[PDB]
């Protein structure tokens, strides 16, 4: 399986995206340009229907949740583990606000 | 609990960068990514079960198997130490947070 | 001794004024500084060495291409100029000092500077090229910062390979064939497999005896950041700038540590 954010502060996630091998994800044929802030999530979304729910991706992860579409990503909970997201801290603060998984864990 | 590993291993991960940048610039990026030497990124499954219930079990590159390295960058050694040492906390967040679904 | 005041004087004057000033910030300070070089246009060939120096590693940046297009972000005038994929490298292989010793030393393109690993050997040996085209241009007290520079960059390459990059193919052999007193006496370093031998090796030299010390800081880097970080310690020898000589290289290398500090102090 594959595990990648691809919505991220770029260097935050290159930091454990891809060094020795596997592209990232597979770059070559998945995945998507690691650095946020050049739009709103849905596109994050979007890379998420091409690599979450493309039966590779397992783990993906959003930062803070400052723009992943809280209400929008909370609907990953049925098939939990090719949806199973994050919420990495660094340039924004890890928070038990609202978010994807971290929404239902509120409950 | 494993939260707050999502607080610290970032904070370290920020540490390494800012000293990678300090040490060699902007990073390479692009082709191969840079910012890091280990986390040849591939995640491999298992299926538990506790009361009956099918716990699934995550393992991955730096976390677990399918790992790889080679070269890295000037502070590659700090930038797996600390970016890619994030690695094991967030593959253990992500079983516990698929277990904790399957269990609800 | 009369040619200073024959020519240069008034850019002399003018660039120790400006070195003497000195002290999305860094990137401003870095405009500024870029901005500072570029308007100052036998001085030119120094200046464009200089320009070159980074430009190498422009060039080497741009090669990739892979999301090429994001190098216009980083478009500094210092060391982006646009003056300065065989086919691509052929045309860029022009106005460029170390570019036609690559075209054929790295005539293998992407299979001889793979992102991994040879494409910062690629960049390693344009870098000494460019130190050997720099250091070509004798006459002047630069040459001993010039040197000290390539072996700083041949040390720390070295130590690398020994660290880590061994396994990267990066042997004896390639800590010069490949990995860019260095220039008649590096072969020392090629054994010094540990701290302790890095240290041994470097005792060779009592000016480089003691720079390792514990070799926890500095050294901890790869790529050339091990023998590099002692000539940025050791630096404060280019603060002398004793007159009536070529200082622009140390002006442009204190403003390029300036910016490199200020960019290290980002959010304290």
Known sequence: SALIAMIADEDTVTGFLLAGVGNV????????????????????????????????????????????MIRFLVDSYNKPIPAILEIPSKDHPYDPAHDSVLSRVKN | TTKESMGEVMKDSSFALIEAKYVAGENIKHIVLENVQNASIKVRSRQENIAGVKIPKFEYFTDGETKNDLTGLARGGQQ????????????????????????? | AMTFNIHGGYLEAIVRGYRAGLLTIVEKCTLKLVDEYKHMLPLSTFLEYITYGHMIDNVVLIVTG??????????????????????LYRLVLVDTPLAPYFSECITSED????????????????????????????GGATAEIMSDLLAFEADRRAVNITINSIGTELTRDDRRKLYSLYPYGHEELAVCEDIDQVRGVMEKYPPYQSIFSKLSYGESQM??????????????????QQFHYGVFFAYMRLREQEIRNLMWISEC
Do not use: W
């Open chain 2, 80 to 104: 797996v130490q600390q970016c890619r040492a994030a690695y094991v906390k967030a593959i253990e967040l992500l079983v516990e947070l698929a277990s904790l679904q399957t269990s609800f």
């Open chain 3, 223 to 240: 790529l050339d950041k091990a023998f590099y970080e002692e000539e940025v310690k050791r630096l404060c020898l280019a603060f002398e």
């Open chain 3, 111 to 138: 299979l001889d500077d793979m992102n991994i690993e040879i494409m910062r050997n690629t960049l390693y040996k344009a870098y000494l090229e460019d130190f050997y085209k720099f250091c070509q241009k004798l």
């Open chain 1, 25 to 68: 994800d597979l770059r070559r044929k998945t995945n998507y340009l690691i650095v946020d802030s050049k739009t709103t999530v849905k596109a994050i979304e979007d890379a998420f229907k091409e690599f979450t729910t493309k039966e590779d991706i397992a783990i993906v992860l959003i930062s803070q949740y400052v723009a992943n």
């Open chain 3, 66 to 87: 892979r999301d090429v297009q994001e190098l216009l972000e980083k478009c500094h005038p210092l060391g982006m100029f646009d003056s300065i994929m065989r086919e």
